[PDB]
Design a binder for this molecule. Structure first.
Ligand SMILES: *[C@@H]1O[C@H](CO)[C@@H](O[C@@H]2O[C@H](CO)[C@@H](O)[C@H](O)[C@H]2NC(C)=O)[C@H](O)[C@H]1NC(C)=O
Ligand SMILES: *[C@@H]1O[C@H](CO)[C@@H](O[C@@H]2O[C@H](CO)[C@@H](O)[C@H](O)[C@H]2NC(C)=O)[C@H](O)[C@H]1NC(C)=O
Lengths: 98, 50, 84
């Protein structure tokens, strides 16, 4: 889990090899690319209550709001199963109604 | 006899220089170890969370 | 001199300061993704939210106590500057 210990990026696995007076490692690493840009928000106020994501983050492409994980782009409709509620929202900065 | 005297001076200064070089090597090894530790700390605690 | 000499270092202090500023701006703006691939922008709120979520405390706390945390951090940095 310690970043940049073995490899360069997220780590998966390794293979050892022999040598005359040493050892050779072949680290197999995972690296993302082909990024996109979206408009975010920290939480959603609905019916006076603040909803937060269980895991991931809220995103939007301009017209609809989705929840996605943090290392890949897969959209899911917002429901009451992947979000949790915590009190009423009057002090959170950045809320957006939906 | 100047050659005898010069031999005395040369041998004395040779031992002095050897001692200095050995001390330098030891200190350099220690500093290299500390630098490696610092590099690990910078690569781990900065670019991520520990 | 008198027999000995001191050579100059390869890297001058300005380049060192430039490197440190680069690292620090990168870690403020992008978080930790810039250590793996290309840096991605991320607002400074939902980066501290992730960092709290890492250590067990849920992310409700940060978004409900932001001003107190800001004041704590500013006061701490002022105190360390004065102590130094
Ligand atoms: C943002 O993405 C959503 C998800 O696809 C888009 O919503 C769909 O848009 C298509 C357009 O052909 C419609 O046929 C679907 O009915 C829409 N789905 C829903 C649930 O409304 C949305 O159009 C995208 N917005 C932008 C600006 O590209
Ligand atoms: C999200 O929409 C709701 C519903 O309109 C907003 O709630 C009201 O917004 C009006 C417009 O300013 C206020 O005068 C009312 O006091 C709000 N509350 C109620 C109970 O009517 C809410 O303000 C919107 N959120 C944002 C960030 O604009």
């Amino acid at each position: 889990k310690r970043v940049d210990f073995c490899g360069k990026g997220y780590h998966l696995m390794s293979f050892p090899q022999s040598a005359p007076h040493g050892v050779v490692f072949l680290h197999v690493t995972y690296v993302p690319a082909q990024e996109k840009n979206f408009t975010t928000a920290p939480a959603i106020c609905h019916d006076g209550k603040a909803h937060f994501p269980r895991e991931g983050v809220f995103v939007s492409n301009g017209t609809h709001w989705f929840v996605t994980q943090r290392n890949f782009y897969e959209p899911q409709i917002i429901t009451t199963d992947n979000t949790f509620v915590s009190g009423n929202c009057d002090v959170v900065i950045g809320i957006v109604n939906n | 006899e100047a050659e005898v005297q010069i031999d005395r001076l040369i041998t004395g200064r040779l031992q002095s220089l050897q001692t200095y070089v050995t001390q330098q090597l030891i200190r350099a090894a220690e500093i290299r170890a500390s630098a490696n530790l610092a590099a690990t700390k910078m690569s781990e605690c900065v670019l991520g969370q520990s | 001199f008198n027999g000995l000499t001191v050579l100059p270092p390869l890297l001058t202090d300005e380049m060192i300061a430039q490197y440190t500023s680069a690292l620090l701006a990168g870690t403020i703006t992008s978080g930790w993704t810039f250590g793996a691939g290309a840096a991605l922008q991320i607002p400074f709120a939902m980066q501290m939210a992730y960092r709290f979520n890492g250590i067990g405390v849920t992310q409700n706390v940060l978004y409900e106590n932001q001003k107190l945390i800001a004041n704590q951090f500013n006061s701490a940095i002022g105190k360390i500057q004065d102590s130094l």
